[PDB]
Amino acid sequence: FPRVKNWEVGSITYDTLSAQAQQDGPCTPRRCLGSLVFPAPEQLLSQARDFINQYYSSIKRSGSQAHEQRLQEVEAEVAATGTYQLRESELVFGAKQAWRNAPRCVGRIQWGKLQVFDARDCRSAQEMFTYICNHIKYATNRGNLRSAITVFPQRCPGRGDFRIWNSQLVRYAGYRQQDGSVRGDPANVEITELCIQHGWTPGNGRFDVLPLLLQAPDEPPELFLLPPELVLEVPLEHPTLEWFAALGLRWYALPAVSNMLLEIGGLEFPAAPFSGWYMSTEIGTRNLCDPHRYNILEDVAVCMDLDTRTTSSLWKDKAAVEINVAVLHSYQLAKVTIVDHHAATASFMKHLENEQKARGGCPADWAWIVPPISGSLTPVFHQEMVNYFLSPAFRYQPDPW
Amino acid sequence: FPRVKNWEVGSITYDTLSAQAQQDGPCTPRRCLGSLVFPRAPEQLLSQARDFINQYYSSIKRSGSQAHEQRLQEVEAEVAATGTYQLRESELVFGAKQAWRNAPRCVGRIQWGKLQVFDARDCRSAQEMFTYICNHIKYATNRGNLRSAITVFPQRCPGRGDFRIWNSQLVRYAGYRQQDGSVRGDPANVEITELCIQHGWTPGNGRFDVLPLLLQAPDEPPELFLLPPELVLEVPLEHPTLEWFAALGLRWYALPAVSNMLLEIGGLEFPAAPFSGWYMSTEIGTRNLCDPHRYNILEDVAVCMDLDTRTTSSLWKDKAAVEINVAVLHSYQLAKVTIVDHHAATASFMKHLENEQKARGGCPADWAWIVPPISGSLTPVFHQEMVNYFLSPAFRYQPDPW
Ligand code: HEM
Numbered sequence: 001f002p003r004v005k006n007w008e009v010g011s012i013t014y015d016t017l018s019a020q021a022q023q024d025g026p027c028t029p030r031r032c033l034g035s036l037v038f039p040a041p042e043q044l045l046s047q048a049r050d051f052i053n054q055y056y057s058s059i060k061r062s063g064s065q066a067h068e069q070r071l072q073e074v075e076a077e078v079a080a081t082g083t084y085q086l087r088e089s090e091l092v093f094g095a096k097q098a099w100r101n102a103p104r105c106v107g108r109i110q111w112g113k114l115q116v117f118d119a120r121d122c123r124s125a126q127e128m129f130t131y132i133c134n135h136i137k138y139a140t141n142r143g144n145l146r147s148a149i150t151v152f153p154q155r156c157p158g159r160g161d162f163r164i165w166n167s168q169l170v171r172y173a174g175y176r177q178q179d180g181s182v183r184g185d186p187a188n189v190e191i192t193e194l195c196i197q198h199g200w201t202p203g204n205g206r207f208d209v210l211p212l213l214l215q216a217p218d219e220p221p222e223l224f225l226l227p228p229e230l231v232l233e234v235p236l237e238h239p240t241l242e243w244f245a246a247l248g249l250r251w252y253a254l255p256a257v258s259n260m261l262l263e264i265g266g267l268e269f270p271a272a273p274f275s276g277w278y279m280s281t282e283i284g285t286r287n288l289c290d291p292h293r294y295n296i297l298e299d300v301a302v303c304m305d306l307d308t309r310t311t312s313s314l315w316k317d318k319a320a321v322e323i324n325v326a327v328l329h330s331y332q333l334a335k336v337t338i339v340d341h342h343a344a345t346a347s348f349m350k351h352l353e354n355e356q357k358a359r360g361g362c363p364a365d366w367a368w369i370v371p372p373i374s375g376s377l378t379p380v381f382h383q384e385m386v387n388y389f390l391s392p393a394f395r396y397q398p399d400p401w
Numbered sequence: 402f403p404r405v406k407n408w409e410v411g412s413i414t415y416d417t418l419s420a421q422a423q424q425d426g427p428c429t430p431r432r433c434l435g436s437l438v439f440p441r442a443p444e445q446l447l448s449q450a451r452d453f454i455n456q457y458y459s460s461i462k463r464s465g466s467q468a469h470e471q472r473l474q475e476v477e478a479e480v481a482a483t484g485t486y487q488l489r490e491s492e493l494v495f496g497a498k499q500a501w502r503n504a505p506r507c508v509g510r511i512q513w514g515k516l517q518v519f520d521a522r523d524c525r526s527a528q529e530m531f532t533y534i535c536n537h538i539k540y541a542t543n544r545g546n547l548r549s550a551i552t553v554f555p556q557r558c559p560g561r562g563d564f565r566i567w568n569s570q571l572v573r574y575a576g577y578r579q580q581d582g583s584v585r586g587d588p589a590n591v592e593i594t595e596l597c598i599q600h601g602w603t604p605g606n607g608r609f610d611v612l613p614l615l616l617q618a619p620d621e622p623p624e625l626f627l628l629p630p631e632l633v634l635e636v637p638l639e640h641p642t643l644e645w646f647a648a649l650g651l652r653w654y655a656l657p658a659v660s661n662m663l664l665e666i667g668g669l670e671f672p673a674a675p676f677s678g679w680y681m682s683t684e685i686g687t688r689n690l691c692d693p694h695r696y697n698i699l700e701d702v703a704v705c706m707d708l709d710t711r712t713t714s715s716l717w718k719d720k721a722a723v724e725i726n727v728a729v730l731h732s733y734q735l736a737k738v739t740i741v742d743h744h745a746a747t748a749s750f751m752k753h754l755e756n757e758q759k760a761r762g763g764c765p766a767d768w769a770w771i772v773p774p775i776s777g778s779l780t781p782v783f784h785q786e787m788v789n790y791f792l793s794p795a796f797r798y799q800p801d802p803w
């Protein structure tokens with residue numbers, strides 16, 4: 001049982017939860033690989049038992065016989081079909097645990113408050129699209145963002161998956177120029193190509209919302225364009241730097257990740273788009289200032305009349321902060337939900353304490369919990385953490401193509 | 402071998418050096434403890450020693466030569482006769498440089514071959530330690546043009562106490578616990594402070610009082626020695642455009658000289674082996690002055706800068722912090738004392754990575770310690786995947802001798 005210290009406070013806890021870690025991460029006693037981005041009925045049954053037992057203990061009915069009724073019910077269903085169906089209550093619970101268990105999520109204070117949309121009855125790409133449009137509409141909620149997940153049918157043998165080819169529901173195009181550069185978002189060059197390949201007539205803005213590439217089982221994907229009324233965006237302005245608006249920067253309201261696979265009691269849902277709301281550093285530091293994303297830092301520093309020929313002026317730092325100020329200011333002015341890295345990490349600290357009392361620990365990935373600016377100015381910097389894999393879980397998955 | 406990717410560039414390497422790791426860290430396939438601050442006869446001494454000698458003869462490209470074979474046989478014989486052995490001077494020099502080279506948490510390793518090694522293994526008294534230490538400080542400081550150095554005191558040996566320096570660094574500021582529960586001076590140095598007093602030091606009452614040294618010779622209590630004022634170079638802190646900043650009366654010292662780690666070379670242990678480089682401004686700017694459990698000046702500066710400190714989303718914290726970093730860098734450049742900002746340091750570390758990949762097929766690195774405590778993703782190391790592991794020769798933590 002690892003001993004975990006907070007070095008700001010000197011306080012000590014013990015992670016007993018990590019003893020129950022489902023699968024194995026990439027580390028060994030010889031070498032730590034924690035900085036890496038990517039780490040049969042009997043096998044299915046075993047995972048299924050564990051989930052069901054989990055669920056009943058969470059509702060104070062372990063040793064009950066609704067428990068044992070459910071237990072043997074699943075045993076019979078897989079015995080007869082090779083898979084099994086989750087009760088809707090079990091799907092909600094599994095969806096919340098999987099969020100709750102995601103080591104790299106700082107927003108997890110909210111894990112018990114999630115809206116789950118059951119789309120397991122989905123049959124077509126058009127249906128998929130309509131489910132997605134309802135999701136986007138519900139979660140956005142005119143700027144008062146609400147956490148939501150939509151769950152499409154589970155993978156099953158002898159049938160293709162439901163997949164959402166886009167990495168997010170809202171993505172900006174990344175147009176490759178022949179000079180090798182990218183207009184728009186470099187992150188989305190691959191999918192901007194694939195959208196075009198599947199017939200999308202490309203735009204040429206720095207912020208063209210992509211079409212959706214949705215794929216029903218065993219059929220090729222189909223292009224669907226989002227009703228621009230559904231896609232809430234925020235023009236970016238700065239509270240006191242009047243020229244900032246003219247840079248023409250914008251970003252969207254809804255972080256709706258669409259390419260991770262959801263696992264629940266051995267069952268795998270390859271298409272289960274979820275969304276929350278943004279931490280400002282995601283937009284302001286990573287998306288706008290990463291060298292391989294929009295990379296706007298020097299543009300802004302030049303506008304701020306900062307000396308950019310030496311690094312000890314900290315021109316890079318001063319401009320990143322102001323870009324983050326503009327993100328925060330613009331979202332608030334537009335009444336769109338957003339949280340700053342200080343507020344968010346303070347909340348995660350509270351979450352650690354709640355989880356320590358709730359489950360005797362909390363899997364956390366330090367490198368992702370600590371914000372990409374002002375890291376040590378936030379409390380999580382000083383908090384030792386233990387990283388491990390529980391189930392249910394959100395996992396990465398290979399590309400559908 | 403671990404595939405390792407840089408996400409800024411897309412480039413990919415493999416760390417084959419990590420397979421040479423022969424001492425275990427805290428992680429398992431079930432749970433990673435990478436973020437923990439403390440990640441922790443004759444035949445294994447010999448396999449440790451043989452490996453080290455092999456390292457040395459490889460380094461001068463005379464592997465398998467008669468001299469290599471001869472030195473192996475010599476060490477084996479000395480171990481057989483005495484239970485230990487002594488490094489040749491040349492081996493010690495290389496050993497110390499290799500320990501620096503092997504430290505996963507040092508972002509300054511581009512410099513690792515430029516290290517001045519003072520050999521103090523003939524040292525016999527605490528008084529003599531002090532002499533060796535003053536000469537260290539003199540050489541390293543070099544009137545503000547800093548030079549990396551290490552002074553190696555005698556090795557651990559059976560039936561004789563260790564040489565120890567009780568202070569964590571050669572230069573430290575006193576931290577006096579106000580009965581308030583608070584602290585005047587530097588809170589990180591409260592225990593060494595009260596020990597200095599308990600051992601006879603007449604204390605001060607300022608925030609930047611330089612601590613005396615408690616030096617320990619074998620089997621003898623620690624002895625108290627005062628640093629000569631003229632030996633301790635300090636920089637007054639001022640801001641290039643914030644003139645009121647100077648009125649905060651802040652200062653730091655020039656020389657970061659860590660004195661409480663254990664140097665380990667080919668099985669031998671050197672409990673006392675102080676080393677020094679030069680500061681990265683974030684250590685002073687962000688950590689030392691803005692950690693809530695250190696000088697904790699962030700809020701006072703933000704108020705002075707007239708920022709809205711009643712709401713996080715104004716980012717008053719980030720703003721005051723950046724300016725404090727600017728002030729440190731400015732002050733040091735003004736005083737003409739070497740210092741490196743975190744942008745330059747990390748870029749040079751990227752260059753170190755590329756050298757090491759070529760030279761050794763890997764480089765042990767602790768991502769959480771290599772990324773600066775501000776502006777992390779603004780620096781290139783943020784996007785570089787890293788493999789953390791323990792090579793020897795090594796610098797190690799060791800228990801406080803009290
Ligand atoms: C409600 C407010 C939320 C906030 C403020 C928040 C914040 C964050 C942030 C900043 C990250 C780092 C992502 C990155 O750096 O790319 C993250 C990661 C993550 N989040 Fe949360 N999140 C929220 C809600 C959710 C929800 C509703 C789910 C799932 C149901 C979720 C699941 C995850 C997962 C699985 C990751 C890992 C990132 C990855 O592997 O790509 N989060 N979150």
Ligand code: HEM
Nearest residue numbers: 501504506507508509512549550676677678679680681796
């Ligand atoms: C010459 C300029 C140097 C720079 C800019 C530099 C930079 C740094 C920094 C910023 C840290 C992290 C400190 C912390 O956060 O507490 C560090 C750690 C470390 N450095 Fe360097 N360093 C330099 C020279 C040296 C030298 C000369 C040695 C030894 C010969 C050394 C050995 C180490 C070791 C062993 C650590 C691990 C820290 C620990 O575990 O407490 N460095 N270095």
Ligand SMILES: Cc1cc(CCNCc2ccc3ccc(N)nc3c2)ccc1C#N
Nearest residue numbers: 037105107255257275276277278279282396
């Ligand atoms: C390019 C890439 C990025 C990543 C992390 C992205 N994580 C996004 C994400 C996921 C979930 C989120 C939930 C809430 C939120 N505010 N942001 C959230 C952001 C992993 C792998 C690759 C690859 N290849």
Ligand SMILES: Cc1cc(CCNCc2ccc3ccc(N)nc3c2)ccc1C#N
Nearest residue numbers: 438439507509657659677678679680681684
């Ligand atoms: C309080 C604490 C702190 C630490 C990190 C200290 N790192 C110092 C250090 C070591 C070598 C350095 C080399 C150069 C430089 N500029 N700073 C350097 C700073 C570890 C354990 C504990 C404990 N307990």
Ligand SMILES: C[C@H](O)[C@H](O)[C@H]1CNc2nc(N)[nH]c(=O)c2N1
Nearest residue numbers: 035036037367368783784785786
């Ligand atoms: C190389 C490094 O592991 C990688 O860039 C990680 C580090 N921490 C991160 N943390 C968050 N929140 N998001 C990220 O994309 C990353 N990237």
Ligand SMILES: C[C@H](O)[C@H](O)[C@H]1CNc2nc(N)[nH]c(=O)c2N1
Nearest residue numbers: 381382383384436437769770771
């Ligand atoms: C808990 C956490 O690992 C701890 O505060 C570490 C993080 N990384 C660090 N990295 C450096 N360079 N210096 C530090 O003091 C720390 N502190």
Ligand SMILES: [Cl-]
Nearest residue numbers: 255282283287
């Ligand atoms: Cl994003």
Ligand SMILES: [Cl-]
Nearest residue numbers: 657684685689
């Ligand atoms: Cl220091």
Ligand SMILES: [Gd]
Nearest residue numbers: 302303304305
């Ligand atoms: Gd101008």
Ligand SMILES: [Gd]
Nearest residue numbers: 641642643644
């Ligand atoms: Gd001024």
Ligand SMILES: [Zn+2]
Nearest residue numbers: 027032428433
């Ligand atoms: Zn690890």
